[PDB]
Amino acid sequence: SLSEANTKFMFDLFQQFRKSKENNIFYSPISITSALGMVLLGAKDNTAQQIKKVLHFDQVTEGNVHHQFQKLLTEFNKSTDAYELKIANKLFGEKTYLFLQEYLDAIKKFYQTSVESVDFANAPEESRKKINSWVESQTNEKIKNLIPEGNIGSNTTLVLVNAIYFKGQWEKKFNKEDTKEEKFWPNKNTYKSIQMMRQYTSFHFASLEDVQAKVLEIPYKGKDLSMIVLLPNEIDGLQKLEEKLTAEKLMEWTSLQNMRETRVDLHLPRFKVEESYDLKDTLRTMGMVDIFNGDADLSGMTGSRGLVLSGVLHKAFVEVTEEGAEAAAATAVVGFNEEFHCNHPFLFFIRQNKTNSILFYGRFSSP
Ligand SMILES: [Zn+2]
Ligand SMILES: [Zn+2]
């Protein structure tokens, strides 16, 4: 399945980010998947095999990555009085550049992509600003400057973008009166102050005696989405939890079968994470290499070989407060009885419960 392939890709990414991200980590795997899916639709041969492999689409059973992405996107684009979820894809092309009508039709149909043309050739700065400004408009202005200066030139011919936006009330809101200053330990011998929200209510909970950690599910109102938190038992237990975590174990540890309704004294910080990623080298390292060099085959975009990707950028935001949470991200592809006290490092993610998809994943290491 496509959701399962997205989680695996998510954990592959995380193992890479652990090398260059010392503190907080936060991203939208689905955003990245959706962008690179749009690329896949116009890739051929080994350019296409590499992408498929890196994203785990070679494991998606009934071309059908795309069919499935269309379902997923329709399922995600739902807002309610209690939350909003939105995911939008767009192609910005050089106004003079021609794409195959079949590539354009395919991205419109499977990825709901809107197509705009811009003047990269003579106004690349202004084109860059238009794109950044569209992203802002899709993310309640939480993702600003997705594409910084110099990642677009007069020779840029395409920018494929995914934006994802979520804002949700908690099913059980925290009382702001109960929020208090506390110590947050990023390391055993070190602390930063933090605003700690506190609540005592029941939640799905499990003790993972094996990895010496706990899991909690914190639902949004309506329960169409939840934030899941994984908290090591020890201040410094995160690395081992990180070493042990795989797609299968996550699915195992976070299924309702393996959790139980439990009264939990939940202490969760008010927090915000903003992180930017240049993914070109990360993606090459994981196996996507033709796409970025002279062996690129993106002839399914234009009728013949010649397009190469110059860049892939990702930016993500999340803020957690007493009322709920707001999370956004965007991806640009450029072509030419129990306690649960979160006062030390933890992993968290926002899950779409119906599809069982992970929309956003992160590590909170330090305010
Ligand atoms: Zn329940
Ligand atoms: Zn308490």
From Swiss-Prot:
SMART domains, from UniProt? SERPIN
Q: Where in the cell is it found?
A: Cytoplasm
Which keywords does this chain's UniProt record carry? Acetylation, Cytoplasm, Protease inhibitor, Serine protease inhibitor
- Name any one GO molecular function: protease binding
InterPro entries for this protein: Serpin_CS, Serpin_dom, Serpin_fam, Serpin_sf, Serpin_sf_1, Serpin_sf_2
Kindly summarize what the UniProt induction comment says about this protein's expression: Strongly up-regulated in the upper epidermis of sun-exposed skin.
Q: Which Gene3D superfamilies does the entry mention?
A: Alpha-1-antitrypsin, domain 1, Antithrombin, subunit I, domain 2
Q: What is its main location?
A: cytoplasm
- A biological process from GO: negative regulation of endopeptidase activity
Q: Name one GO cellular component term.
A: plasma membrane
**Tissues with expression:** Squamous cells. Expressed in some hepatocellular carcinoma (at protein level).
Complex formation: Interacts with MAPK8/JNK1.
- Which family does this protein fall into? Belongs to the serpin family. Ov-serpin subfamily.
What does this gene product do?
May act as a papain-like cysteine protease inhibitor to modulate the host immune response against tumor cells. Also functions as an inhibitor of UV-induced apoptosis via suppression of the activity of c-Jun NH(2)-terminal kinase (JNK1).
Can you say what this protein is called?
Serpin B3
Encoding gene, per UniProt annotation = SERPINB3
